[PDB]
Design a protein around this ligand. Structure first.
Ligand SMILES: [Cl-]
Ligand SMILES: [Cl-]
Ligand SMILES: [Cl-]
Length: 110
């Protein structure tokens, strides 16, 4: 098809990467180790940047966007706080911010 579907397909793919990766980060946090955790942490942020960049391109070409959410803004702003909490070592934040994140995700996917 057009390059506008390729963008629609990649928005959808990157959202699925983030959804997948957030589920795994979530449970490493109930388990695992800074090793895997920090690794999944960066994967999730890599997916979300791709998604964001794809979104800019769809907006440029005015592509007909079907956006499953926008707790998307909610999710991204909460994920930025989570990273600041992690990087600050602030562990009590981490648990609160991780719950809010799981709540947004489930609101979108269901
Ligand atoms: Cl989507
Ligand atoms: Cl908070
Ligand atoms: Cl919410």
């Amino acid at each position: 098809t057009t390059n506008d579907e390729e963008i629609a397909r990649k928005l959808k793919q990157t959202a699925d990467e983030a959804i997948q990766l957030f589920q795994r980060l979530r449970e490493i946090f109930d388990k695992g180790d800074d090793d895997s955790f920090e690794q999944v942490l960066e994967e999730l942020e890599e997916a979300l940047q791709k998604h964001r960049q794809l979104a800019n391109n769809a907006r440029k070409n005015g592509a007909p966007t079907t956006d499953l959410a926008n707790l998307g803004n909610r999710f991204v702003q909460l994920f930025q706080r989570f990273r600041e909490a992690w990087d600050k070592g602030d562990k009590d934040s981490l648990e609160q911010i991780l719950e809010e994140l799981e709540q947004v995700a489930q609101k979108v996917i269901s």
